[PDB]
Amino acid sequence: SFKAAGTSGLILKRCSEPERYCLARLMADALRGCVPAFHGVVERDGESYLQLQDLLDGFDGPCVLDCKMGVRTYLEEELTKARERPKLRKDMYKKMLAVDPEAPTEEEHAQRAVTKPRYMQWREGISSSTTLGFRIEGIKKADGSCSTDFKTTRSREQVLRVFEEFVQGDEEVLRRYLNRLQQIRDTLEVSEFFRRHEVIGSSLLFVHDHCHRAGVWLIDFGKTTPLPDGQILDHRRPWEEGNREDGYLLGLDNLIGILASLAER
Ligand SMILES: Nc1ncnc2c1ncn2[C@@H]1O[C@H](COP(=O)(O)OP(=O)(O)NP(=O)(O)O)[C@@H](O)[C@H]1O
Ligand SMILES: O=P(O)(O)O[C@@H]1[C@H](O)[C@H](O)[C@@H](OP(=O)(O)O)[C@H](OP(=O)(O)O)[C@H]1O
Ligand SMILES: [Mn+2]
C-alpha cells in the first residue's frame, strides 16, 4: 500500500476515492493538524498515490503503535451486501478456528467460509473493540521488532499493559501522548468534518522516540463516509443498524482513561 516519495519528508499511499475525499476536506477542517498533511495526488507506474507527510520523519528511531478506533469496524452497507449476495471468505474462516474452534457455526464449518461482517464482528468481540471502542493492532520499532499479536487483547488492564510495555517507563512520552489525546478529543468535538462523517476503520497512530518526542495522528480514511443531508452522529451512543454510529469517541474516552490510569501507577 505504501511507496517512497521523491521529496524529503513525504510518503506515498495508493489512492482510494473515499480517502482522497476525506484528506482534502480535513486540510480545511479543525482536524487539519491531527492528521498527516495531504499534498495532493501523483502518478507512478500508471497508478494514483496520495502524497502524505511521513509522520516518522521528525523522530530518531521511532516506536509506533497503531490503534483501530471504533466499536464497529465495517460499513453498514457490508451487512446489506452479506444478506443479498454473500461473498464467502475462506481465509477468515481459518483464523476463527485458530483463536476459537467453537466460534464458527455448524453451517460455517460446512462452508469453510464466513461473511466479512461476520468475521469483523467476531474480531471486535474477542478484542477490546466492542467493550472499549478501540483496539491495539500492532507495534513497530526501530529496535526492528514488530508485533501484530493482539487479537485477544480485550480487558482494560490487558490494554494498559501493552501501553506500559510500549512507553517503557518514559514519563515524558506518556504525558505528551496524554496531552495530545486531550487536544485531539477537543478538536474532534468541534470538528465539522467529524460530526458529519461516519469514521470506520481509521486508527490513531502513536509515535515516540528515545529523545522523548511523542506525537499522535488520525490515519486511514478509506472507510470514512459522509452522512446524508445534515444528519449527524454523537460518536458515543451504541451502534444499532440504521443509526450509523461508530463509537469513535467512546473509544477515545476509554483510551485517554487508560493512559491517565497508567500515568498514576
Ligand atoms: N502518513 C504516514 N506516515 C508514516 N507512517 C504512516 C503514515 N500513514 C500510515 N503509516 C503507517 O503505515 C501503517 C499502515 O497505515 P494505514 O493508513 O492504516 O494503511 P492501510 O494499508 O490502508 N490499512 P490497514 O490494512 O488497516 O493497514 C500504519 O499502522 C503506520 O505504521
Ligand atoms: O485485520 P484483519 O483481521 O486481518 O482483517 C482486515 C482488517 O479489518 C482491514 O482493516 C480490512 O480492511 P478495511 O478496513 O478496508 O475493510 C480487511 O478487509 P478486506 O479483507 O475485505 O479488505 C480485513 O481483512
Ligand atoms: Mn488502517
**CB-based pocket (< 6 A), ligand 2:** 73, 116, 123, 201, 222-223
In the numeric block, the cell 470506520 is attached to 200
Phi, psi (degrees; rounded to nearest 5) at 178: -70, -45
For ion ligand 3, residues whose CB falls within 5 Å: 220
Looking from the CA of residue 137, the nearest atom of ligand 2 is 1
53: Cβ below 6 Å to ligand 1?
Answer: yes
Give the orientation angle of helix 116-126 with respect to helix 90-99, to 10 degrees: 20
Residue 190 identity: V
64 within ligand 1 shell (Cβ under 6 A)? yes
Ligand 3 center to 232 CA (angstroms): 24
265 CA distance to ligand 3 centroid (A)? Answer: 31
Rounded Cα distance between 40 and 201, Å, is 22
The set of residues, in sequence order, having a beta carbon less than 8 Å from that of 99 and lying 6+ positions away, is 126, 151, 152
CA 130 to the chain's CA centroid:
14
209 is in an annotated binding site: no
Cα distances from 254 to residues 27, 75, 86, 164, 250, in angstroms, run 27, 22, 34, 16, 6
Annotated binding residue 239? no
- The Cα–Cα gap between 144 and 162 comes to 17
| Burial bucket for residue 251 (CB in 10 Å: 0-12, 13-18, 19+) | buried
Q: How far is CA 207 from the centre of its chain?
A: 14
CA dist 70 and 201 (Å) reads 7
Ligand 1 centroid from CA 219, angstroms:
7
DSSP symbols for 192-242: HHHHTEEEES-EEEEEE-TT--EEEEEE--TEEEEPSTT----SSSPP-TT
Quoted resolution (Å):
2.0
Q: SS3 for 128?
A: coil
For the chain, the structural domain boundaries read 1-265
In 88-202, at which residue ranges do the beta strands (DSSP E only) sit?
134-140, 146-147, 197-200
Residue pair 82/39 in contact by the 8 Å Cβ criterion: no
For domain 1-265, the question of CATH label 3.60.110.10 is answered with no
Q: What angle do CA 141, 52, 255 make, to 5 degrees?
A: 50
Mutate-to-test residue for ligand 1 from 20, 73, 140, 220, highest number of ligand atoms within 8 A of CB: 220
User: One-letter amino acid identity for 246?
Assistant: D
Give me 81's grid cell. 451486501
Cell of 257: 482513561
CB 154 within 8 A of CB 160: no
Distance 264 CA to ligand 3 centre (A): 31
Which method, experimentally, gave rise to this model? X-ray
In the chain, what is the greatest distance between 2 CA atoms, to the nearest angstrom? 54
**Which residue has its alpha carbon closest to ligand 2 atom 22?**
116
